[PDB]
Symmetry: C5
Subunit: 394 residues, 5 copies
Amino acid sequence: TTQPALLRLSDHLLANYKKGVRPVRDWRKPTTVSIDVIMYAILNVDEKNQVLTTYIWYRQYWTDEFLQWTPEDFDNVTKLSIPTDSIWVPDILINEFVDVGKSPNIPYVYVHHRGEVQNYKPLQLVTACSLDIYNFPFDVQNCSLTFTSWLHTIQDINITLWRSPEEVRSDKSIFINQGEWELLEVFPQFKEFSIDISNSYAEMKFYVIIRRRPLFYAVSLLLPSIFLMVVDIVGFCLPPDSGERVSFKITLLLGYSVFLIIVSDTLPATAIGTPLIGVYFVVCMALLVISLAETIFIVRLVHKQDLQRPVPDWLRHLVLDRIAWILCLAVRGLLQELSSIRHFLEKRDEMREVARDWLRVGYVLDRLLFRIYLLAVLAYSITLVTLWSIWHYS
Amino acid sequence: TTQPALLRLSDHLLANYKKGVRPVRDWRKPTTVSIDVIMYAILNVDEKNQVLTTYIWYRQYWTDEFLQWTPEDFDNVTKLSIPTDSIWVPDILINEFVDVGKSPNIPYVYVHHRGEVQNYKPLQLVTACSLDIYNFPFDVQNCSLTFTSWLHTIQDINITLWRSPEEVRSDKSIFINQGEWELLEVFPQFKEFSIDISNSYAEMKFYVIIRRRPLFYAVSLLLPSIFLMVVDIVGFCLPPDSGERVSFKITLLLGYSVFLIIVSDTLPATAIGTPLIGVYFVVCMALLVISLAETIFIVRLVHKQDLQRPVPDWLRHLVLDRIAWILCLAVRGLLQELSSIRHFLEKRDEMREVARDWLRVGYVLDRLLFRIYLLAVLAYSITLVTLWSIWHYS
Amino acid sequence: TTQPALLRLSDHLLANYKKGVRPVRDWRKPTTVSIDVIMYAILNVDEKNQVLTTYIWYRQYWTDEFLQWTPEDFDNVTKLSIPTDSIWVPDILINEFVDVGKSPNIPYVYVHHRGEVQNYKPLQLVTACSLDIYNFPFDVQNCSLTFTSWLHTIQDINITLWRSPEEVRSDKSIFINQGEWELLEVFPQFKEFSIDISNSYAEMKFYVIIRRRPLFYAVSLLLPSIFLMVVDIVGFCLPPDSGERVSFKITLLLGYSVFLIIVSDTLPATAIGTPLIGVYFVVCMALLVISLAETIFIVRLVHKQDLQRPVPDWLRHLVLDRIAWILCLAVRGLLQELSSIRHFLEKRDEMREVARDWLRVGYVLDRLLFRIYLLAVLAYSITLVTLWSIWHYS
Amino acid sequence: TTQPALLRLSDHLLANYKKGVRPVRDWRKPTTVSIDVIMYAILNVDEKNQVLTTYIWYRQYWTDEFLQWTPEDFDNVTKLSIPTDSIWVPDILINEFVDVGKSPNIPYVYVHHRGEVQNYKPLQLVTACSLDIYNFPFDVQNCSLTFTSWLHTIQDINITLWRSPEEVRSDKSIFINQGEWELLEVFPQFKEFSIDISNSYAEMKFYVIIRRRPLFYAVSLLLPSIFLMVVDIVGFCLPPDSGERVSFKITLLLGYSVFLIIVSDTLPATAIGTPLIGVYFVVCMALLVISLAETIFIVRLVHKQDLQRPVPDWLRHLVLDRIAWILCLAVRGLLQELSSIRHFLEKRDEMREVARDWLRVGYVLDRLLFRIYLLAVLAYSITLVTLWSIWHYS
Amino acid sequence: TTQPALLRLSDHLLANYKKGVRPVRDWRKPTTVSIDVIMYAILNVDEKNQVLTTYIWYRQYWTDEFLQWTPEDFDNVTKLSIPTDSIWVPDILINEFVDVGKSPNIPYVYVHHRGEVQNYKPLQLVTACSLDIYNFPFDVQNCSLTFTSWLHTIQDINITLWRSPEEVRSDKSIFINQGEWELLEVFPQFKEFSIDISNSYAEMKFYVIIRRRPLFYAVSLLLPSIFLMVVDIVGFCLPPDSGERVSFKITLLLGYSVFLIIVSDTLPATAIGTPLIGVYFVVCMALLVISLAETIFIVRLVHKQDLQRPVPDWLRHLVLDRIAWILCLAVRGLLQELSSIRHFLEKRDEMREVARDWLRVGYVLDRLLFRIYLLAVLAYSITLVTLWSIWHYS
Ligand SMILES: *[C@@H]1O[C@H](CO)[C@H](O[C@@H]2O[C@H](CO)[C@@H](O)[C@H](O)[C@H]2NC(C)=O)[C@H](O)[C@H]1NC(C)=O
Ligand SMILES: *[C@@H]1O[C@H](CO)[C@H](O[C@@H]2O[C@H](CO)[C@@H](O)[C@H](O)[C@H]2NC(C)=O)[C@H](O)[C@H]1NC(C)=O
Ligand SMILES: Cc1nccn1CC1CCc2c(c3ccccc3n2C)C1=O
């Protein structure tokens, strides 16, 4: 030979090479690819459509007996680059595809002098997964990625791992944080899928486990929920016979019903009904209708509608018993005129004695029901805290 | 011959192969493809645009007399992989396309030693279908997928099924649940479409039947609808002559009119007008205007506008009859002064006797109309339940 | 010859075939394509951007003298399939393109034994059209599709119809209904476009005519518009001197101003200003400010501000004339004390005689203005109906 | 020769043709393309992202010495069609690209018998431009399109115009109107860009000038802005001591604060802060807080809080001076009883003489401040009109 | 030779050229590309998804020993254009890709007569970056772009800069301003990445530093925040015993709670919780509940509920001490009648002496708490200004 360059190697082993045949000498031996995956970003999690969108880095190698040479007599070269669209490439797909992601192409591969062809490529993938929203801001997910050959059976293409499955589990090296989702582990597992006898497909199954960072959802829906509690605590300081107390309570019930609608648009719920957050807002509604149902009852008792005497059954029971529980001819003709005028006033002042007994009853019930409502807020406030400390401790 | 590899088979039957001709020896026999479909995901159902978006797995096989060999004298090989873009592939399309879905390509096929070419491919498909929204949260749909050859007539390409149509009906194996739609069955049916004489197109028609899971739409629009009923039940406890009762009722009618607008944006309605849910909200409006039209009538009767006597026709009819139905010189000159003062007060106290008769009438009408409104809520509440039990039982 | 297959025909007429030349023997004769179109779906109508999005089925045929053979001595074959990317295909485009729609490719054509090449293909097309929104829910549109050759003049490519233009007008066979738009007719027309002398382009122009189904827009904006009328009719039943009547009227004017904003976001308007619906909502506003301007006038007259006598010009004119139009030493020292007390009360009771004359005037004006407002609602209600019956009858 | 067809010309000049070389005999002469552009549609103007989206029609011609023939001895043919992907095509791009628009391909070109190759193609283009929003509904824009060769310098590719730059300016022939933007002119200009010595790029620069049609934005934000003025004009007719006047004014200030938020979402603002429309809404707010700050002052003066005498400094100044400016043993024991009763009433009636002086002051200030507020609305109303007439006149 | 054209050079060096081999004579020397980047536009910054979208201009050159010629004997040509898809091109990608941006292709390169191949191309790129939103309207960002060879190691492809890294830092020449983001500098840095021994990848890392223009976010959320302060300042001018003062304060607390919701939708927050703007709105809420908690306390003290004497401990402490701190048989029978009438009035007037002491206390507390609230607004107003002047000065 001569020494024109060292492209004469690439002339030697791609002259009569057929890129359609599965590259083995004996057709009874399978081609064994070897894959692994490191995780780069969680792009989107769609809880409504049950669709996960990620981005991984991927690599694989296999072996072919048509790409071999002796390293000497080619000036000691041991590896070179060959374009991707001129050799045989296996068809490794994912079972959980629902769409095609856009990813850059890598137009070259490595080839060592034994036939080991290495292939590095990144690929965005959109998959379908089952998402449980039982406990919304504190939830781990368990999504699957199943690499498999879509056509070839197990006596043609077999799938192994590159490296040992302990290094794949504990590899959080190039992941992008600060993005609402925290990667925990990526655990691989081989299983040998078969649809019947004599048609078996090898497949490799990766389980990704991600956990939501709950810090976003303690200022968007926990902060106004405890804020409209303390507005009702200062709302009971109004005296009941004023008139604005009824207009006060219906205004913020209108104000909180707007809050339930505008926030439930940005919080999904699938296949369960509601999460456990939706239970803890019905308790917020029921704790506020009882606030409205007790100011609707004092106003009915404290009013001037020409009403009768307070019952002495319920005067002894209320005023005197709750004082230790919560608190601590012309001379005749003019005489007929004046006695009728006095009768017109002694009818009037006892009608002012109507209210002062019912005002006294209506104030003792208002301070009694204020303490019971203040405990029910306080008893439920520690229950919401003492469940959060169970999660936070380890 | 020699033994250089076993790509000499692929040299043998793709040397002078023409990928343009329909592959038969005698041109009078049709090519018979054989298809079937299993269902993977319901991606989107657009009730406004009448467009369904799914994702299926698809496979097919046919037969060609140009891809045949004897299995012996090729070292007993019986099947091999051939790239897809180097053989004849039939053009099986869908009639109901409105767009092109993105799906991965599969670059290989199988070829057995008789000519049976097998082809596996997944394909996302966007179709047009007729959607009935007559009963919104409880509705089954009946969508069609019609596989047909777009150019070739029935004496060129004929379509059969792979397997028997009982296995295709009862195949819910890899479907993705927890996604608002439940797959019921996929039923195939062959029919022989013809536009005129001597131009007949074979086609295979799959009917997918899906049912909506109604659990999403019992917390988003059933829960506030029964909530603003119980606010009006505690709204009648206000006495009518206070003044805030009219301001109470108009506030939540404003509050519910916001609710009808914000929820009807996320609930579609096509070609019918409204579903049966929209009928059951006009009843919610008419049951609340009557709540406003009766507090607008007691306030007109219970007021101090210098008004006359209550009619004894309507005192005997109301107070005494509904008590068993629902409830159980200087001596003359000073005398002229005092008699004029008494006349100024005996005019005043009978004007306080104005209201106490009309307050008494206005309270009996308020407890009478409270019972009738409480039954009409209760009579309609059981009717809404007793229709739900008909659906739920089988 | 031999009998190896019958691909020897396709070897015969695609051996030395050049797919770049316009296929005629004499270069002076034009190639005459023949097209027609049936309509499949109206996908989107964007009134803001003036862009129509449809989906049609399309077919065409032409003639070439290079694809001819005698049917005998090829075993009586008369037609065959040839791939599309190996023959000459004319460039028929649309003038009104603004974008490229995604549509499936059809990789085969028919070729008869005279040169008649048939080509079936579906194609989604996005076009630009002029949309008049003068009368919004009752509007027909007149959109154009202009098929033309983009490069070749009329002495190279000429365009005819497949079938007669009566069959193209009356062809509503595979159109997808229940989709807000109803197809009326598709009328073709040939016209011979020229930019100057000796450069003339043949073109075929289809006019599609679609009509909007108005049933969607009688429950989304007609139903709340007549609903807030009847709330004002029961709003005049409040007596004016109560105080909540002013707070009642401003609440639903706030409530209707929200309705004008949230509904005008989903109703377009281009190049005219407003449609005729927007005129019929300014009348709804002006009919409700007059409702607010008359309750602002009775409250000014019916009030206790230490005011003077009602004018006897306007007592004879109002109370007595509208009763037939709408309705049917110590004895001296004590005497100085009592006469001063009587003077303190006879000043008081005539101040109660202030209001009872002005209450009587304010009630007659309230029942007078109630009848005039009730007719103006009733006179405008029949005018809105009697224009709808003109449209509905034929 | 023979007469087999007239594709023997296309065999003559595409046999040994190389589509990679820049087609000149002498390599020192540049290839001179000649372009022009007519404008078809303004698809989108994104004021937030500074991105313009249009659609043009484009054509160009150049000259090559490899595509020449004598018209005789080819049966007098003078031009023919050649596919586009088999000749040299220059790389004319735009500097202002930010994305790639989808546009149809035209697979043919013309070639005359001197080498003049003509090329017609439409192309959608998305560009980046500077948009000034200083005066929002009345604004012209000045966007640039710069055609240039991306690689070749000026001694390889030079750019000229097809026709004279007066015809390109005054060409509004196929533009699509009724689309919020009106085309004014398209003015071309050649400039010779150079990055240093001996590397100069020729470029042709088109300036498009578009003007917004302001009719869309006189019914969406001018009509409610003048509507909530006239509600405050009829809002001053309430007497101040009623009580609903304060609740009236805060309701529509709530009602207008909703209007500022919902309309500013659909009105952009970049790099300036606000346009001049945002200045004319702060004036609308400041003209309405002064309406609230004067009803907050009369209610403070007109009230019953056990208050003292009106100051005679401010009684002479107010009541009597503004009447020409805006308006036009037993006999002793009973005597001690009656004198104490008279003292209890003569204390009461002078407390009714409290308010009637302060009511009289509070009514004169209310009619005084009503005239000043009515002029300030009227003085600003003509200023808003007299600036609109400056724009409208020429 | 002859002189047929000067495409005989392009025949000379692309006849037997292989576009797959890495073009070196000795395979032990690496190919050294040389890149740089100028910055054109910041298209989008997505703070939620941590994704940056830009558009750059890019160029590179390398050297190959297969594209060399002597400039003489080819008529002195020194450079020419060669199509891009017929030579070797290195695979320079970015590590931070998450998607593929659409960018125009440039189909030509330059080749000098030593082998220097130059390549100009623009490219839109979508990358992933870490965004800190600790201080929202005043924030610089530090995003990375890492150019690297995706397959070849450092003994195959090595990366250098075109020009010195001082010119790349100070190059703001063609950047598009007026677009919410200001470019500060683009600083390059070479680092030599290695995954283990004997596998090292060269990479070049550009740091772009952008700063947000804060002018957009001083009219959208600073202007209504200081506006609803001055409405509460004129809200304390109401006297407390009127009744509308409680209804005034709850209306704008409803009005500001709408403002917090509608503006927080368009303001992102990631991985921190809230920015420092969210701290300065909780102070706006706490400064307004204290405004509501002090009008809820004066109304409780200033009311008529049949209450007792003001405590002389708190009369000396309040009224007299804060006056220097903030402010500056028949004769017996008729006698029994009149003494009972006087007793009925001397009970009444001292009940009018109930309120005038509590009105006097309630007015001194109202002017005292008005000054303290007016200082706390004024003390916090200068603190918000004096932090803004620290940023603005240099
Ligand atoms: C995610 O879901 C997997 C289900 O396939 C896990 O399940 C079980 O895991 C154990 C060991 O990890 C396997 O032996 C077992 O076969 C497997 N179950 C099935 C049905 O395959 C996995 O553990 C889950 N992850 C987490 C973190 O819970
Ligand atoms: C952006 O972030 C960079 C981090 O990689 C900067 O960090 C440090 O910069 C100095 C000189 O600029 C380097 O010597 C040092 O290696 C580098 N740190 C690391 C970990 O690489 C850079 O300065 C930052 N820019 C700004 C403007 O802060
Ligand atoms: C980023 C980069 N710079 C030059 C090349 N590359 C790509 C690259 C480098 C290292 C690497 C992978 C990978 C993919 C899957 C498992 C492990 C992996 N490891 C270690 C890659 O894809």
